[PDB]
Amino acid sequence: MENFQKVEKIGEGTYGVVYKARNKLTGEVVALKKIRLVPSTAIREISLLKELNHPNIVKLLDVIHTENKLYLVFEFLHQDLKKFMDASALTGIPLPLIKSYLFQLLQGLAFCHSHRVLHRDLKPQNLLINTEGAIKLADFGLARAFGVPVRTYTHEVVTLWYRAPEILLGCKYYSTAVDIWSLGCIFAEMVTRRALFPGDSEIDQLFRIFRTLGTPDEVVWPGVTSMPDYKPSFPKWARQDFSKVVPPLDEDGRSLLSQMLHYDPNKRISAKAALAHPFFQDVTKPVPHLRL
Numbered sequence: 001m002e003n004f005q006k007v008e009k010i011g012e013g014t015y016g017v018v019y020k021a022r023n024k025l026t027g028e029v030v031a032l033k034k035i036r037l038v039p040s041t042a043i044r045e046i047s048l049l050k051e052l053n054h055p056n057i058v059k060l061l062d063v064i065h066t067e068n069k070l071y072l073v074f075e076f077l078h079q080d081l082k083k084f085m086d087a088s089a090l091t092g093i094p095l096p097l098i099k100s101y102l103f104q105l106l107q108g109l110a111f112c113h114s115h116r117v118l119h120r121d122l123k124p125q126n127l128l129i130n131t132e133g134a135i136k137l138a139d140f141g142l143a144r145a146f147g148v149p150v151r152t153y154t155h156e157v158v159t160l161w162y163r164a165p166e167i168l169l170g171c172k173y174y175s176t177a178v179d180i181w182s183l184g185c186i187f188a189e190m191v192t193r194r195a196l197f198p199g200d201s202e203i204d205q206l207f208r209i210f211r212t213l214g215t216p217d218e219v220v221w222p223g224v225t226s227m228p229d230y231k232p233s234f235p236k237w238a239r240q241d242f243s244k245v246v247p248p249l250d251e252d253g254r255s256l257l258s259q260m261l262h263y264d265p266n267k268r269i270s271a272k273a274a275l276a277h278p279f280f281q282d283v284t285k286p287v288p289h290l291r292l
């Protein structure tokens with residue numbers, strides 16, 4: 001902590017505050033996260049994260065466990081996907097770049113999934129971009145370490161918008177499919193320039209998903225009716241056309257999203273399978289127009 005000079009606050013997560021900071025010795029510019037809470041298992045989970053290195057995962061440079069406090073020192077990235085979407089709002093992010101970004105996030109996901117590590121809380125604000133055309137996942141594995149509360153330390157309400165329905169229906173065992181779901185939500189938002197399911201309570205979130213995708217039943221999702229928060233009294237809505245949901249996404253794009261948004265997590269496409277989907281046949285890596 002005293003080895004770093006704070007430059008500016010750049011965010012507030014479910015785990016505490018994030019600063020751009022500079023390392024007083026080496027000169028390195030990092031993202032410094034002080035974790036609010038250190039339990040011996042948090043230490044051990046977090047230390048596993050230090051080995052989980054990939055070009056599409058924000059590098060955890062150091063864990064500083066000092067004075068009974070916990071700091072995470074990350075590779076610094078200058079912008080998030082929310083800010084970039086908002087800045088690209090008038091014409092949309094070009095599809096070639098959407099495709100490149102979706103392709104890289106799926107590589108990062110396939111990587112972490114293959115090491116049995118989930119994100120659990122993907123969202124535009126933890127997807128980070130550079131001037132080189134890269135996109136990276138931030139805070140991977142942190143939710144399994146400190147817990148996703150309803151409010152942050154500053155009382156900010158956590159988004160439900162990207163939450164998978166198995167989580168909303170109270171499944172205690174998350175699988176990697178929850179990340180695919182969130183990433184599918186983000187894909188749709190990139191394309192349409194609107195959030196797919198902007199719920200403002202758990203039942204609002206659920207009911208927005210049902211209105212678009214049809215209330216789930218035993219046909220499409222064996223087991224759904226026996227989940228902890230499933231209620232027979234849930235209204236039964238019919239599905240909508242994806243054609244109606246993400247114009248002007250093309251047929252390959254629509255077919256992948258549909259597989260990323262399958263109700264049953266066991267039918268939901270894997271990151272590795274989605275990488276082989278025809279939508280990526282012509283993937284490229286454009287450089288974005290970034291104002292920093």
Ligand SMILES: NS(=O)(=O)c1ccc(Nc2cc(OCC3CCCCC3)nc3ncnn23)cc1
Pocket residue numbers: 010011012013014018031058074075076077078079080083084125126128138139
């Ligand atoms: N809003 S912004 O585009 O200017 C922006 C976004 C992000 C960052 N940098 C950043 C921010 C960050 O915080 C991530 C968020 C995730 C959602 C919850 C708040 C923290 N973690 C990070 N790790 C490396 N860089 N980095 C810098 C600027």
